[PDB]
Write a protein that binds this ligand. Structure first.
Ligand code: ADN
Ligand code: ZN
Length: 262
């Protein structure tokens, strides 16, 4: 339930890969004035939840140029991760694009991308590796109380749980290997091999195998946001990848093998 305390309203979107649908909710939140960190394109803000509710007050309207399209939206939203993970009082992180080559579609793609990587994390863990991994939930929020931009586009953001500890990036989306840890690189290799080269998960970053904001490359280069560099991204990973003990333990081929022709 949404608290009566002072904060701003949002439409909250959760993607559920197993039913292949978005779940639409509302929430109230209070976000700090200044960001605590920044990346290339976005800034991160500390936020507290003032509760999660239904989307009943905020009708979608007609389905012509609705994103996501109505057929991708669950009619029912009684069950979801948000109602426990974003319950009243929860401290979490909000990310906003600075200064904006970001369509509406991009916010949803990026969050769906994180949910897909979250599935890959569970698949990896089922092999009983020495260190289990996990990707945080992420959500799209339409900050509906904020006045639209120069164009009548609502203000959009993504939100995710707060990581406590030293945040480290382990690889980039274009071949950088940034720490000496084995598990992040083995996981990237695992995703390439076990997907039959349909995709790779890189930008493996977070605190101690609790990861967030990954990026996927696919051979055809379609979908998965603007950070999908296609075969180029896959090949760049291969040039710098050196199999380690976790790769061996997972019985991964030391020969990675070529990209798919489109
Ligand atoms: N979920 C999160 N929890 C805490 N810090 C984060 C989170 N996501 C991103 N960051 C911070 O923002 C930076 C990204 O530029 C990271 O280096 C990290 O310091
Ligand atoms: Zn390897």
């Amino acid at each position: 339930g949404i608290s009566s305390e002072t904060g701003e309203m949002g439409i909250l979107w959760e993607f559920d890969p197993i039913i292949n649908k978005w779940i639409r909710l509302s929430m109230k939140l209070k976000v700090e004035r200044k960001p605590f960190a920044e990346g290339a394109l976005r800034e991160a803000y500390h936020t507290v939840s003032l509760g999660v509710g239904t989307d009943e007050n905020y009708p979608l309207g007609t389905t012509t140029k609705l994103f996501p399209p109505i057929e991708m939206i669950s009619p029912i939203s009684k069950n979801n991760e948000a109602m426990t993970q974003l319950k009243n009082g929860t401290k979490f992180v909000l990310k906003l694009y600075k200064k904006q080559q970001a369509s509406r579609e991009l916010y949803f793609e990026d969050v769906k991308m994180q949910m897909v990587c979250r599935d890959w994390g569970n698949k990896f863990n089922q092999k009983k590796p020495p260190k289990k991994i996990e990707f945080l939930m992420s959500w799209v929020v339409e900050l509906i109380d904020r006045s639209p931009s120069s164009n009548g586009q609502p203000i959009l953001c993504s939100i995710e749980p707060l990581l406590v500890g030293e945040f480290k990036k382990n690889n980039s989306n274009y071949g950088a290997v940034l720490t000496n840890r084995s598990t992040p690189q083995a996981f990237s290799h695992f995703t390439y091999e076990l997907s039959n080269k349909q995709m790779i998960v890189v930008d493996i970053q977070g605190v101690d195998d609790l990861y967030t904001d990954p990026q996927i490359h696919t051979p055809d280069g379609k979908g998965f946001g603007l950070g999908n560099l296609g075969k180029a991204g896959i090949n760049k990973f291969i040039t710098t990848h050196k199999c380690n003990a976790v790769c061996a333990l997972l019985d991964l081929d030391v020969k990675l093998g070529g990209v798919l022709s489109g």
